[PDB]
Symmetry: C3
Subunit: 116 residues, 3 copies
């Protein structure tokens, strides 16, 4: 049961590693998310505000990774132009963008509310 955990953790690290190595944009996003978590962790806010600040940027990373898994599947099927290939990447990018706008807005609402 905890043999599945080890194996799964190993796959997870490989995914993070590959995402980091292969694109500057993912590394820069990773920097942004880590800076936000650190800032949230040190900010003088209540616990529920702290969790909202942290979990909104975490969600960006989650959807980013899920969208990148979709892209890899699409690219696996081939370099071919295909209507559903394009559509699959369009839907997934849209998801990523919603998560990001949500994080940004969540941060602006709460920090403005905090007035600091």
């Amino acid at each position: 049961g905890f043999t599945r955990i080890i194996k799964a953790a190993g796959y997870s690290w490989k995914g993070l590693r590959a995402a980091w190595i292969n694109e500057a944009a993912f590394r820069q996003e990773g920097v942004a998310v880590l800076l936000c978590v650190v800032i949230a962790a040190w900010l003088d806010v209540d616990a529920v505000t702290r969790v909202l600040l942290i979990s909104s940027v975490m969600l960006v990373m989650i959807v980013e990774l899920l969208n990148s898994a979709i892209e890899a599947v699409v690219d696996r099927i081939g370099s071919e132009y295909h209507e559903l290939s394009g559509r699959a990447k369009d839907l997934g990018s849209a998801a990523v963008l919603i998560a990001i706008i949500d994080a940004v807005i969540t941060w602006a609402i709460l920090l403005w509310s905090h007035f600091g």
Copy 2:
């Protein structure tokens, strides 16, 4: 078609949240939970696009992929309903 009725769904939820006199935290939760449903539906549709891209022939793993996807959407929606029920109950408590 079934895409913009979802856009109306969320805009209506945003209008309600705006209209209700709740604090910033409550409003973020109300709206986030609806936006998660949207994120999950889009990721699900992406997966369905990929499945249909491989072939429109039936295959156990194709059915499996779509049903797991749709189960994800259902959980997100249950999560939204729970969120709205709990926060409104507390607001009007």
Copy 3:
């Protein structure tokens, strides 16, 4: 349909379910309760999407491709981030609660 039978989902699902039951009984304010519940729901959502990705990969066939491994690894990383987010959420909110 046929996936809820398997040991892997049964185990993941029961953990999430227990956490929701516990969150429902805790003496916490409303916003705290919502965050405890949706953080573990999110783990279940992401696990379900990860498995959906795995199924599409396996659907393509058994021949290994670098990008097939990558899709599964990336899906697994998302699950890990959702789980860390759940643990952080419960720790921050219930630290305050004891």
